[PDB]
């Protein structure tokens, strides 16, 4: 037909905006990112595509990130357009605390930060972001939380998701063995299994990965953005008997 593909404000006769859906296949090129919601602490996870030998894949976390001492993110999409809206998020959370003097809830910035990704699928000769996220938080109103944001602006709250490549199985494998209690250390041993069983390679090293953890587990209650280093995933990794 007369091809309705060239601007994100064109509305094909069937009612569907094509140039948004394209973004939702610009994400499959990405690198997988997983998060499971425990009963006593969320876990996240990740996986990288490029892993040549002569580049420092030790300290540089490229996907996992923080927003403050309560909230963490795991990206899946273009990387030019992650700094743009993860500094903005930091700059949003502080500028809430700064003027209500209490911590940011998750359902605010996910609500906000997704409307930003809708302010570009509507007006101007602009593009929509190729981005997704996996939020992981805590707050008095609901406690533990998990959330997700497409490159459209639509968000939904979940219990366990994978984004990026090969989620099809990685949901399927997940949803048929996710118990509902799942103590934290019993969650990690699930997340690796998904990435172990879904990927393309067979090595699943210590360098290709990073997986972090939120923890309320301390006495004198408070939150702990525990990120894991290369030296202890190895303990996670030998312990399973890969």
């Amino acid at each position: 037909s007369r091809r309705y593909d060239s601007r994100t404000t064109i509305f094909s006769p069937e009612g569907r905006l094509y140039q948004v859906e394209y973004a939702l296949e610009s994400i499959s090129h990405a690198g997988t990112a997983i998060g499971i919601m425990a009963s006593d602490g969320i876990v996240l996870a990740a996986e990288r595509k490029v892993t040549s030998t002569l580049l420092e894949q030790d300290t540089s976390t490229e996907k996992l990130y923080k927003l403050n001492d309560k909230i963490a993110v795991a990206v899946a999409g273009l990387t030019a357009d992650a700094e743009i809206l993860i500094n903005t998020a930091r700059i949003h959370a502080q500028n809430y605390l700064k003027t209500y003097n209490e911590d940011i809830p998750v359902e605010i910035l996910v609500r906000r930060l997704s409307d930003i990704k809708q302010g570009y699928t509507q007006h101007g000769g602009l593009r929509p972001f190729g981005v997704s996220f996996i939020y992981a938080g805590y707050d008095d109103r609901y406690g533990y939380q998990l959330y997700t944001s497409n490159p459209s602006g639509n968000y939904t709250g979940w219990k366990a998701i994978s984004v990026g490549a090969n989620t099809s199985a990685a949901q399927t494998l997940l949803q048929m063995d996710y118990k509902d209690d799942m103590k934290v250390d019993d969650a990690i041993e699930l997340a690796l299994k998904t990435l172990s069983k879904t990927t393309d390679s067979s090595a699943l090293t210590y360098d290709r990965l990073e997986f972090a953890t939120i923890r309320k587990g301390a006495n004198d209650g408070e939150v702990y953005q525990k990120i894991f280093k290369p030296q202890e995933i190895k303990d996670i990794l030998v312990k399973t008997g890969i």
């Binding site: 394209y22 939702l24 296949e25 610009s26 000769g125 602009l126 190729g130």
Partner: peptide, 10 residues
Amino acid sequence: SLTTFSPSGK
């Protein structure tokens, strides 16, 4: 042009 995605999301 740059702001246009192709079906492979590129």
